[PDB]
Write a protein that binds this ligand. Structure first.
Ligand SMILES: NS(=O)(=O)c1ccc(NC(=O)Nc2ccc(F)cc2)cc1
Ligand SMILES: [Zn+2]
Length: 257
């Protein structure tokens, strides 16, 4: 099926998911001097104090930390959003080299990785229903640059050895995702899509201005994961990012000046 290689990568996805060429595809380049400050945008409300992490898992295209989304526990609200969105999972996209790896870009600049905190609109009842709606998901995107270590990321780094290959998972309870956030919650926002198949056009994107810094040792451990399953020819899980897509008839709004 689909992946990030030369014969199944982003240039191939449209054949099984024709919405790949749709009108609100993600990621995009954020042109900072074309994004307009919108003074009617509210501050984001990130309420993660009650977050309950469950598992960490290699799904053959990234690794994901999953949360209990059966109650309002870890929710995103405010910003451009109406209503309440529950945190379901987070995952990353990263490169083979530090100059590439993010999905969104900023004035064509690529960061070393990008964190996606995936939330779904509780008015649709379950995530499967939400992905069929134009306002079903809100993904909070955070850029990673290589510099100083991110202490809140180390517990994730520590366990990646135990989920090296596709299909492996581990208990990952009591993880606090607040340790992955930068200081500022200033943000760009636009309407877009999932960046992996099925590429559904169901996402309000909220991309934070301020990257987090992670150490070279931390991102190196990302690069030691495998796309393949156990026992099969080792292909390093690197460059699992979709490139920027046409902005088409969309405006990116900034919450800052
Ligand atoms: N890389 S991204 O845009 O943040 C993203 C987030 C979520 C998905 N996929 C997803 O959530 N699928 C899903 C559908 C129904 C379910 F019940 C659960 C998951 C794909 C890309
Ligand atoms: Zn993602």
């Amino acid at each position: 099926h689909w992946g990030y290689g030369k014969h199944n990568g982003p240039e191939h996805w449209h054949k099984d998911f024709p919405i790949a060429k749709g009108e609100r595809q993600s990621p995009v380049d954020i042109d900072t001097h074309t994004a307009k400050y919108d003074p009617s945008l509210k501050p984001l409300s990130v309420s993660y104090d009650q977050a309950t992490s469950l598992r960490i898992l290699n799904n053959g295209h990234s690794f994901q930390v999953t949360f209990d989304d059966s109650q309002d526990k870890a929710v995103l609200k405010g910003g451009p959003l109406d209503g309440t969105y529950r945190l379901l999972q987070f995952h990353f996209h990263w490169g083979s080299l530090d100059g590439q790896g993010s999905e969104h870009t900023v004035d064509k600049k690529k960061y070393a990785a990008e964190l996606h905190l995936v939330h779904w609109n509780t008015k649709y009842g379950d995530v499967g229903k939400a992905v069929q709606q134009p306002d079903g998901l809100a993904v909070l995107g955070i850029f990673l640059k290589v510099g100083s270590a991110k202490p809140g990321l180390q517990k994730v780094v520590d366990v990646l050895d135990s989920i090296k290959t596709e299909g492996k998972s581990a208990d990952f309870t009591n993880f606090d995702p607040r340790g992955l956030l930068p200081e500022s919650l200033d943000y760009w926002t636009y309407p877009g899509s999932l960046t992996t198949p099925p590429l559904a056009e169901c996402v309000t994107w909220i991309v934070l201005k301020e990257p987090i810094s992670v150490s070279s040792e931390q991102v190196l451990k990302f690069r030691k994961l495998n796309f393949n399953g156990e026992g099969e020819p080792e292909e390093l899980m690197v460059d699992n990012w979709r490139p920027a897509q046409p902005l088409k008839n969309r405006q990116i709004k900034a919450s800052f000046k």
